[PDB]
Structure formats: structure tokens, C-alpha cells
A paper describes a structure:
In mammals, PS is synthesized de novo by two endoplasmic reticulum (ER) transmembrane enzymes, phosphatidylserine synthase 1 (PSS1) and phosphatidylserine synthase 2 (PSS2). While PSS2 specifically converts PE to PS, PSS1 utilizes both PC and PE as substrates. PSS1 adopts a homodimeric assembly with dimensions of ~100 × 75 × 50 Å. The structure can be categorized into three functional domains: (1) the scaffold domain (TMs 1–3 and 9), which interacts extensively with its counterpart in the opposing protomer to form the dimer interface; (2) the core domain (TMs 4–8 and 10), which constitutes the catalytic center of both protomers, positioned ~65 Å apart and oriented toward the ER lumen; and (3) the PS-binding domain, comprising PH4 and adjacent loops, which create a membrane-parallel platform that accommodates two PS molecules.
Here we determined cryo-EM structures of full-length human PSS1 in apo (PSS1apo), Ca2+-bound (PSS1Ca) and Ca2+/l-Serine-bound (PSS1ser) states, revealing how Ca2+, l-serine and an endogenous PC molecule are positioned in proximity to the negatively charged pocket to facilitate the base-exchange reaction. In the structures of PSS1apo, PSS1Ca and PSS1ser, we observed a PC molecule (PC1) positioned within the catalytic core, between the halve created by TM4 and TM8 on the lipid leaflet side. This suggests that PC binds to the catalytic center independently of l-serine or Ca2+. In the PSS1Ca structure, we observed a Ca2+ in the catalytic center and surrounded by acidic residues including E197, E200 and D221. The imidazole side chain of H172 directly interacts with the phosphoester group of PC1 at a distance of 2.9 Å. These interactions are not observed in the PSS1apo structure when Ca2+ is absent, because of the less well-resolved local densities for the headgroup of PC1 and the sidechain of H172, despite the similar overall map quality.
Numbering used by the authors:
A (entry chain A), B (entry chain B): 14 to 140, 159 to 408
């Protein structure tokens, strides 16, 4: 009750501790009101509004910007408080915008969605060997895996997800057999080098952060210029690292089911990315692909932390709002891919779709024994 | 600091006191997660999306519906906690929807706004004596004035703004001289009966509610059926009524200028209503006209109590988020009228627009002496 609302406030709206420069946190919401009104007056009395399409585009951009401002004013900032809670409020505002956009798309038919996508960018309408495969997107995949390893902190989770998803991508070759590819490309380059290296780097960084002691001093008290610069740059780094062990030695059935649902939703997000790219046929270099991946990772970090907090802490009896929104976003992307994807499906074998559900369950069951037996030894 | 955040929480997120039926307040945000996903699955796989135009309409309704659900989870509930804080989160969720809508319109040109309005309702494109003037809108205008009187509790405000607006509504006859009307339409029917009668009814309600003692008991503890029914209907009535006195006997210049801004923004909302009807031609009977007045009426109730809290209590050092949004909405509607209204502007004398600014200042200055001198006697 009294603790419940406080325990949930530690998941939704984490407060900033040890505020030295009070200027950075004192609200000035009336100044924000004046700024918004004056900006709208300028953009309404000086802008040129003779072109319809550009008017619609700029209106959409302005609506997004001022929804971000409203999110700063009202929305919660998750379990994170660096560099500033306003940033995570803005990320939550983007999450809500995306969730509503996905809600809208479920009512338009395929022709209307295609027309909207062509409106977003008209160019869509027209649309040894080891060394060559490395690219910027391999860099992105590796760094995303590193961030996931940082946030999850379990080899038996990240590796299970990596192997399962790589095998699913290999199995879904029949959807797009035109492209010239081999199993080795999506086995070695991904499981061994990209995903493996990302997981290793993330794990070593998490190990460092867990045993690092945090001695955040006031930016004002520091005297030397190099010290001030170091304090400024180190702010973007986390101020603390929670001790994340998913599997208790005496874990109950509820905890195992929670971790299983976590892994299932992770694979669902990977599947949503794959099938969105497949159905709406934009290249990986297109902003609608890598921008969405970046946004999903930025959502994923606080969502992972909130899901861990809800699953472990027995005092927390409400799931955080960002984790809720991420769950809705993942499931709505799955529904969108289902609804708009019946054209490419011919003789769907869900027998493989059932297959990793047991294979994840078998592996998350060996994770228990692999630790329960190791706990004895 | 510690009190500041606590005191602002009393304006933004008022908590429910003496919770007896805990069922009505226990969150079930995972059940709300399963409800939306299952709801969209039904509307995505069973609905017929062959009509391009009706898909956009139902999509807009769905986005609005699922922004209320997000607003229930995240947005604050103002200074009000009856009949349930969720309702006042949905009412806030409409304010953010409406405020962002006005941000969009400030970039569209007059042809697109008209084209958008005809889309909402295609019928817009084509578009003794005392007893006869009474109508349903006189009922609304009276009850709107009665509702305001509850939240203000001062004759020297509700009458100053009633008198000075009715003369400003009457002075604007030159803008629309086609309609056959006389000065006595807005002199006896409104100033004396509609507005004057509404204020009197509103004031006697406050006189009752302020000296009424509140003895809210458990709904379960009540035994008789008539008592249970009486308790249920009585929930929609307020649980408490704060003693509001705008003018302190020793009021400072910051307080007088605080009330002066309240009087000015009140006219602006009255001025916005008159103009956007005149600019975008639609009659009062249209749902685009009376629908907006009902929404602004519901928005006004928490905004007045948040503005009063900010004005008086020296501990409150942040204006509530609902009072912030209503300030932006009341101004964006004025910018919208200015940008799209230059066609009717021919030889505008802002001399009368300056005129009530002094006339309100003179009357809000006599309100001081009218109370300061009465305080001595
Ligand atoms: C982007 C704009 C916002 C900036 C974001 C990042 C800042 C960078 C450098 C900072 C510059 C100075 C500004 C600092 C912002 C102050 C920190 C900040 O989030 O305040 C905002 C108000 O919003 C402005 O008052 C914001 C006014 C800032 C602009 C002032 C000058 C405008 C020209 C709210 O805080 P707060 O946690 O008390 O506010 C609420 C919060 O809205 C909800 O979590 C809950 O309702 C409640 O628990 C409580 O936490
Ligand atoms: C419309 C649905 C919402 C209902 C509105 C009016 C209710 C009528 C009869 C009620 C029936 C049972 C439902 C009761 C709703 C419980 C009350 C309610 O607002 O909870 C919501 C969650 O939202 C559901 O968990 C809502 C789940 C309700 C639906 C459950 C079954 C679905 C089928 C959250 O409140 P709360 O203040 O703890 O939560 C937050 C609040 O979101 C923000 O003000 C802040 O983040 C924070 O300060 C804190 O106050
Ligand atoms: C057609 C296809 C065919 C194949 C289909 C295959 C189907 C396969 C089968 C799948 C079935 C799996 C069933 C698992 C049930 C778990 C129940 C359980 O343990 O309860 C709880 C956990 O579970 C929860 O409820 C947690 C919150 C979830 C809600 C937010 C969603 C956001 C997700 C985003 C997640 C993040 C993802 C990040 C991504 C990187 C724990 O019990 P509790 O007592 O509530 O917890 C105690 C804690 N308190 C309450 C005391 C504080
Ligand atoms: C230029 C723009 C305006 C400038 C002034 C600004 C004022 C802004 C306005 C504010 C008032 C909001 C009400 C708008 C009036 C509705 C339009 C109308 O007359 O059409 C009726 C809708 O009848 C219904 O069935 C209503 C369904 C639920 C309500 C949805 C309304 C939109 C969101 C409101 C929810 C609250 C959100 C915030 C509230 C502020 C009848 O039409 P229909 O039977 O649907 O006929 C089908 C034709 N189409 C439309 C499908 C093609
Ligand atoms: C071209 C046309 C020509 C004609 C133009 C005519 C121009 C006419 C000229 C107008 C000039 C009037 C200027 C007066 C400024 C005085 C300010 C003042 O005293 O500060 C504060 C009040 O003022 C505020 O700042 C309050 C919050 C306002 C922001 C939210 C707006 C929402 C409105 C929604 C209104 C709802 C309406 C509902 C209606 C039914 C008080 O001082 P403070 O020290 O901050 O307060 C102490 C308390 N704390 C801080 C210690 C806690
Ligand atoms: C923010 C935290 C990281 C975000 C997740 C990784 C992003 C990612 O993989 O995008 C990547 C872009 O790479 C970037 O631009 C990200 C750069 C590193 C992250 C900053 C996208 O990579 P991908 O969509 O997995 O590429 C697969 C598509 N092909 C190569 C098969 C055609
Ligand atoms: C499943 C419906 C049952 C349900 O929500 O029970 C939940 C119980 O169960 C749980 O606590 C775990 C729920 C597992 C996650 C399910 C997310 C919804 C995905 C649907 C996918 C589509 C389904 C069809 C297609 C497959 C209900 O939650 P609760 O008991 O009211 O807990 C209250 C929530 N807090 C405040 C405690 C956070
Ligand atoms: C909710 C709180 C009350 C809302 C304010 C009153 C609304 C109002 O005046 O609308 C009224 C409708 O009346 C209603 O439908 C509301 C009835 C009262 C509801 C309580 C509209 O009245 P109005 O737009 O002021 O009418 C002026 C326009 N003519 C007569 C000149 C053509
Ligand atoms: C006016 C700009 C200066 C300003 O806002 O100073 C304010 C100071 O002073 C006030 O508090 C006065 C507020 C008066 C209301 C102005 C609303 C904006 C309307 C513009 C219309 C268009 C203008 C041009 C067309 C006429 C700024 O407030 P602050 O000092 O940052 O106080 C912080 C706010 N809380 C947290 C205390 C709430
Ligand atoms: C660009 C700024 C450079 C860095 C300037 C700098 O010194 O930042 C310090 C401030 C916070 O200063 P404190 O050390 O009191 O808060 C810290 C808190 N008590 C804790 O340790 O948790 O950072 C921000 O607000 C965010 C700034 C960035 C806004 C995007
Ligand atoms: C401009 C943005 C710069 C990037 C800002 C940045 O990295 O800081 C975000 C958080 C900071 O975490 P806190 O210090 O608030 O607490 C942490 C919390 N108590 C915990 O338990 O971990 O770190 C991550 O999530 C790092 C993962 C990658 C995130 C992308
Ligand atoms: C339809 C319900 C009929 C009325 C049924 C009824 O008995 O309501 C009681 C509940 C709350 O009951 P309490 O007296 O414990 O809370 C009140 C608090 N202790 C106080 O006094 O402030 O009211 C609602 O949630 C109303 C939601 C209505 C749905 C919006
Ligand atoms: C379905 C909706 C039914 C209508 C519900 C209704 O009337 O309740 C809303 C509030 C109730 O106020 P509280 O009891 O939360 O506290 C009051 C606060 N502490 C104070 O200081 O006043 O009353 C008004 O604003 C009445 C004005 C008219 C509002 C339209
Ligand atoms: C949480 C962070 C969200 C970041 C969103 C990234 C989207 C960027 C899109 C850029 C498009 C550029 C086209 C030229
Ligand atoms: C705060 C309460 C908001 C209520 C909004 C009222 C809008 C109703 C519009 C109904 C249109 C009906 C057209 C047939």
C-alpha cells in the first residue's frame, strides 16, 4: 500500500539523488509555455503555407515535437535518471507515439499502408568472402548485441536467443530464396563473430560496472579543467548498476514462467523486425529500418530494467508503464505483420514456429540445472 | 524541496483518501494489456477494410480511444479525485489530443482546414419576443455560467466578465451585421437572466457546499438499499469544497496581477469561441460547436482549481500540468483565429480590444477597495 506506491514509483518515476547544480532540475514550465506560444506565433505568421504536402509534413513534425514537450511535462521517466530524466520522458513519448501509430495501421488496408509509406519517401515506390560480409550493419548488430548483453547479463539467455533467432532466420530462407546466400553467412558471421563478440563485450563491460564503485562528486567542487571535462563526459555513463541475476537457486515456477515470457517476447521482437522488413520491402539502408531498430533499442533498455525489477522484487506489484508500452508495441507489430502478410504466406509450417517455443523452454530448463548443480559445486 | 514536490503532487496527482472498496483502485495494468491486444486482433482480422474512407475514420477513433487508455496509465489526474481519478486522466488525455490538433492546424492553410472540416461533416460545405429567445443553448449558456460560479466564488469576477464580454459580443455586430438582432437580445436575455441567473444559482450552491460537513462512509457499511443508492449517486458530487478567496485584504501586487491574468485568459476563451465559429462557418447546433464548449467546460473545472492553488499558496511553486495545457489551448485557439481570420478583418479597431483590458483592470481595482473598505466596516 504505502510501500506499494513507493515501490512502483521506483520503477516508473525514479528521482535524481544528490542534486548539486539545482539549476538543471528546477522546473520552468511557464517559460516552456511562453516558448511554445511564441514559436507557434512565428511559425504561423512568418512561414509560407502555399504548398499543401510540405504543410502536412511540417505539421506532423511540429505535432511530434510538442508531444515530446508534453511528455517532458507529464510522462514518467522509467527506472533511469541519467543524463536527465527528461530524455527518458521523451523516449517514452516516442514509444507512445509509435504505439498509437501501430494502432492506426491495423485499420488501414494494404493499399493505404503502401500509399502512406510511398508518401513518407517516394523512392520506395520504384523498389576472402569473410571480409566482404562485414559492413556498417554488422557493426550495428554487434553493438546492439553488446547493449543487450549489458542489460540482460546472462550468457544462457543472450546465447539462447542468438542461436534460436539465427536458426529461425536461416529457416525463413524459403520466403526469399531469390537472394544468393549460404548457411555459413548466417552461422559463422553472426553466431560466432557478430553476436558472440557483442555478447562478450557487453558481458565484460557489465562485469566492470558491477564491481565499480561510484563516487559522483559535484561538478562545481571539481577544480581542474580536465576533471570538469571528465565529470561532464562521465555523466552519460550510468550512475549505478543493479545486480541482475535472473535465476534464483530456489526459483519458483512463477519466476521461470516470467523468464520464459521474457525470452518469448524477445524472439517476438526479432520476428517483428524481420517480417516488417519483409512485408513492407524497404532496404536495410532505408531510415524506416535502422531508425526503427535504434528506437527499439532505446525503448528496450528501460523496458528490460523494469521487467527485471517487476519479476524479481516481490514488493513491486505493478509493471512499469514503459514495459507495458513496449509489450503492446511488440504485440501490435506482430498483429500488423500477421494481418498484412497473408500474401507471402503459402503453406505456413508453424511446426517450426512451435519448435523454438519448446527449444527455448528446454534451454531455460537447462539453465536452472546448469546453475543448480553448479551451486552445489 | 521535499515539501515542494509533495505540494505540487497535491495539485497534479491528488490521491484518494479513505479507500474502503480497494477493488475500484487496485491497478490491473496487465489485464489492460491483454484487453487491448485481444481487442485489436478482433478489429484486424474480422473487420472489413474494403472502404478506404471509413478505414481512416475508424482508425482515428481507435487512436483516440487508445490514447485515453494510455492517459489513464500515465497522465496526472489534476486536483480532483471523484468519481474516480481515471476519469480526470482521460479528460486530460483529451486536452493533449486537442492541444496537438491545434498545433497541426497552425501549419495548414485555409483551404486545407476547410477541406479537413468538410471531411468531418460534409453538410458544412453547403453552409412575446422574450419567450421566443429561450432555447436549448440558453439552457447551456445559463448552466455554463452556473458551473463557472462554483469554481470562482466571487460576484466581482463572474459579473465583471459577464458584463464586459456581452458588450464585446454586442460590439462585434459590425463583423456580422447580416443577422437581424437588437441590443436587448444581449442586454436582458443574457446579462440579466441567462448569465445573471446562472451566477446566482452557482453562488448559492457554493454557499451550501462550503458550510456542508462531509461524512463519507463506507459503501459496504451502509445496510439499507436506499442508503446504498444514495451513496452511489452522491459519489458524483464533490467530496470536499475548498474555501476560495481570490482577494486577500493585504493582497500584494503579485496577487492582483495574478487575478488580472485570470480575468484576461477568461475573456480569451470567450473570444476564441466567438471567432472560430465566425471564421470556420458552422452553426451552434453542429457537434463541432457545442462539442467544443462541453470539452472546454470540463477542462475549466480542474484548471480553475489549479490556478487558484498556484496563485494563493506560497508553497506551491509549479503550475499544474492541466492548467498549463489549458493555457496553451486558450492561446493557440487565438493564434488560429488570427492566422485564418484576416479575410474578415478590414479596418479593425483594436481600440475596443484595448478597451476592456483597462475596464477589467479598473473593475478588479474597485474589487480591492470594495473589499478593503468593507473589511474595515
Ligand atoms: C526540451 C526542454 C526540456 C529540457 C530537457 C532537458 C534539459 C536540459 C538542460 C536543462 C535546462 C533547464 C531545464 C530543466 C528542466 C527541469 C527538469 C524537468 O524535467 O522539469 C520538468 C518540467 O519541465 C520544465 O520545466 C522544462 C523547462 C525547460 C526549458 C526552460 C526554458 C525554455 C526556453 C518536470 O520535472 P519534475 O520531475 O519536477 O516533473 C514531474 C514530471 O512531469 C512527472 O514525472 C510527474 O508529474 C512528477 O513526478 C514530476 O517528476
Ligand atoms: C477504462 C479502463 C480504466 C478504468 C477507469 C475507471 C474505472 C472504473 C471501474 C473500475 C474497475 C477496476 C479498475 C480500476 C482502475 C484502478 C485505478 C487506476 O486508474 O489505475 C491505473 C492503472 O490502470 C489500470 O490498472 C486500469 C485497469 C482497468 C481495466 C481492468 C479490466 C480490463 C478488461 C493507475 O492508477 P494509479 O494512481 O495507481 O497509477 C499511477 C497513475 O497512472 C499516474 O497518476 C502516476 O503514474 C502515478 O502517480 C500513479 O498514480
Ligand atoms: C502462433 C504462434 C505459435 C507459437 C506460440 C508460442 C507460445 C509459447 C508460450 C508462452 C506462454 C508463456 C506464459 C508465461 C506466463 C508468465 C506469468 C508470470 O510468471 O507472471 C509474472 C511474470 O510475468 C508477468 O506478468 C510480467 C509482466 C508481463 C506484462 C508486461 C508485458 C511486457 C513484455 C515485455 C518484456 C520485456 C521484453 C524485452 C525485449 C528485449 C511473475 O509472477 P508474479 O507473482 O506476477 O511476479 C511476482 C512479482 N510481484 C507481482 C510480486 C511484484
Ligand atoms: C476545422 C476543424 C474544427 C475547428 C474548430 C476546432 C474544434 C474541434 C472540435 C471539438 C469537438 C469534438 C467533436 C467533433 C464533432 C464530430 C464531427 C461530426 O460532426 O461528425 C459526427 C460524428 O458523429 C459520431 O459518430 C461521433 C463519433 C465519436 C466522436 C468523434 C469526433 C472526433 C473526436 C472527438 C472526441 C474528443 C476529442 C477532443 C475533443 C475536443 C457525424 O458524422 P458521422 O456520423 O461520423 O458521419 C460519417 C462521416 N465521416 C466523418 C466518417 C467522414
Ligand atoms: C493584441 C491584443 C491587445 C489587448 C491585450 C491586453 C493585455 C492585458 C494585459 C495583461 C498583462 C497581465 C500580466 C500579469 C502577470 C503577473 C504574473 C504573476 O503575478 O505571477 C503569478 C500569477 O501568474 C502566473 O504566473 C500564474 C500561472 C500562469 C501560467 C499558466 C497560464 C494558464 C492560464 C489558465 C487560466 C484559467 C482561465 C479559466 C477561465 C474560466 C503569481 O506570482 P508568483 O510569485 O508566481 O505566485 C506565488 C505563488 N508561488 C509561485 C509561490 C507558488
Ligand atoms: C541504440 C542502441 C543500439 C541499437 C541496436 C543496434 C542497431 C542496429 O543493429 O542497426 C543496424 C544498423 O546499424 C546502425 O546504424 C547502428 C549503429 C550502432 C548502434 C548505435 C541494422 O542492422 P540490421 O537491421 O540487423 O541489418 C540486417 C539487414 N541486412 C544486412 C541483412 C540487409
Ligand atoms: C493472458 C491473459 C491473462 C492475463 O493477462 O492475466 C494476468 C495475470 O497473469 C499474469 O500475471 C501474467 C500474464 C502473462 C502476460 C500476458 C500479457 C498479455 C498478452 C496477450 C497476448 C494475446 C493473447 C492471445 C494470443 C496468444 C492479469 O493480470 P492481473 O492478475 O490483473 O495482474 C495485474 C497487473 N499488475 C498490476 C500486477 C501488473
Ligand atoms: C459541462 C459543463 C457545462 C458546459 C458549458 C455549457 C455549454 C454551453 O453553453 O453549450 C451550449 C449548448 O448547450 C448544451 O448543449 C450544454 C447544456 C449544459 C450542459 C451542462 C452552446 O451555447 P453557445 O454556443 O454559447 O450558444 C450561442 C450561439 N447562438 C445561440 C448565438 C447561436
Ligand atoms: C511572458 C514571458 C515571461 C514569463 O513567462 O515569465 C515567467 C515569470 O513570470 C511569471 O511567472 C509571469 C507569468 C505570466 C504569464 C505568461 C504566460 C505566457 C504567455 C505568452 C503569450 C505570448 C506573448 C506575446 C504576445 C502578447 C516565467 O516563469 P519562471 O520565472 O520560469 O517560473 C517558473 C514556472 N513555475 C515552475 C514557477 C510555474
Ligand atoms: C551538457 C551538460 C554537460 C555536463 C554538465 C554537468 O555538470 O552536468 C551535471 C548535471 C547534474 O548535476 P548534479 O551533479 O547536481 O546531478 C547529478 C545527480 N545528482 C546524480 O549524480 O545522479 O547534469 C544534468 O542535469 C544533465 C546535463 C545534460 C543534459 C542533456
Ligand atoms: C544521450 C544519451 C546518452 C546515453 C545515456 C546513458 O547511457 O545512460 C542511460 C542509463 C543510465 O542509467 P542511470 O545512471 O540513470 O541508472 C541506471 C539504473 N539505475 C540501472 O539499474 O542500470 O544507462 C543505460 O541504460 C546504459 C545502457 C545503454 C542505453 C542506450
Ligand atoms: C458506478 C459506481 C457506483 C458507486 C459505487 C460505489 O460504492 O463507489 C465507491 C467507489 C470507491 O469507494 P470508496 O468509498 O472506498 O472510495 C471513495 C473515497 N474513499 C472517497 O470518499 O474519496 O467509487 C468509485 O470508484 C466510483 C467509480 C465509478 C465509475 C467511474
Ligand atoms: C461523470 C462525471 C460526473 C461529475 C463529477 C463531479 O462533479 O465531480 C468532479 C469534482 C469532484 O471533486 P472532488 O470530490 O474530487 O474534490 C474537489 C476538490 N477537492 C475541490 O477543491 O473542489 O467536482 C467538480 O469539479 C464539480 C464542478 C463541475 C465539474 C463538471
Ligand atoms: C530513443 C531514440 C530514438 C531515435 C529515433 C531515430 C530516428 C532517426 C530518423 C532519421 C531519418 C533521416 C532521413 C534522412
Ligand atoms: C470532458 C468531457 C469531454 C466530452 C466531449 C464531448 C464531445 C461529444 C461529441 C459528440 C458528437 C455527436 C455527433 C452525432
Amino acid at each position: 500500500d504505502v510501500n506499494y506506491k513507493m515501490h512502483f514509483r521506483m520503477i516508473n518515476e525514479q528521482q535524481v539523488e544528490d542534486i548539486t547544480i539545482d539549476f538543471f532540475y528546477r522546473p520552468h514550465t511557464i517559460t516552456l509555455l511562453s516558448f511554445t506560444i511564441v514559436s507557434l506565433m512565428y511559425f504561423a505568421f512568418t512561414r509560407d503555407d502555399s504548398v499543401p504536402e510540405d504543410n502536412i509534413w511540417r505539421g506532423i513534425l511540429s505535432v511530434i515535437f510538442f508531444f515530446l514537450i508534453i511528455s517532458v511535462l507529464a510522462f514518467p521517466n522509467g527506472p533511469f535518471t541519467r543524463p536527465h530524466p527528461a530524455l527518458w520522458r521523451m523516449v517514452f513519448g516516442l514509444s507512445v507515439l509509435y504505439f498509437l501509430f501501430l494502432v492506426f495501421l491495423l485499420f488501414l488496408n494494404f493499399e493505404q499502408v503502401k500509399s502512406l509509406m510511398y508518401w513518407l519517401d517516394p523512392n520506395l515506390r520504384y523498389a576472402e568472402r569473410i571480409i566482404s560480409h562485414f559492413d556498417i550493419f554488422a557493426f550495428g548488430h554487434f553493438w546492439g548485441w553488446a547493449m543487450k548483453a549489458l542489460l540482460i547479463r546472462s550468457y544462457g539467455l543472450c546465447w539462447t536467443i542468438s542461436i534460436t533467432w539465427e536458426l529461425t532466420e536461416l529457416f525463413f530462407m524459403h520466403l526469399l530464396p531469390n537472394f544468393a546466400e549460404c548457411w555459413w553467412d548466417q552461422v559463422i558471421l553472426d553466431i560466432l563473430l557478430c553476436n558472440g563478440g557483442g555478447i562478450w563485450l557487453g558481458m565484460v563491460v557489465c562485469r566492470f560496472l558491477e564491481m565499480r564503485t561510484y563516487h559522483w562528486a559535484s561538478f562545481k567542487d571539481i577544480h581542474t579543467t580536465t576533471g570538469k571535462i571528465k565529470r561532464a563526459v562521465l555523466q552519460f555513463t550510468p550512475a549505478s548498476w543493479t545486480y541482475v541475476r535472473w535465476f534464483d537457486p530456489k526459483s519458483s515456477f512463477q519466476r521461470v514462467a516470467g523468464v520464459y515470457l521474457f525470452m518469448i517476447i524477445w524472439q517476438l521482437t526479432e520476428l517483428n523486425t524481420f517480417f516488417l522488413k519483409h512485408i513492407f520491402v524497404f532496404q536495410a539502408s532505408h531510415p524506416l529500418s535502422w531508425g526503427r531498430i535504434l528506437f527499439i533499442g532505446g525503448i528496450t533498455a528501460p523496458t528490460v530494467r523494469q521487467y527485471y525489477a517487476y519479476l524479481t522484487d516481490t514488493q513491486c506489484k505493478r509493471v512499469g508503464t514503459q514495459c507495458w508500452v513496449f509489450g503492446v508495441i511488440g504485440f501490435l507489430e506482430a498483429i500488423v505483420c500477421i494481418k498484412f502478410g497473408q500474401d507471402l504466406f503459402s503453406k505456413t509450417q508453424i511446426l517450426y514456429v512451435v519448435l523454438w517455443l519448446l527449444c527455448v523452454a528446454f534451454t531455460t530448463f537447462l539453465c536452472l540445472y546448469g546453475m543448480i548443480w553448479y551451486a552445489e559445486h
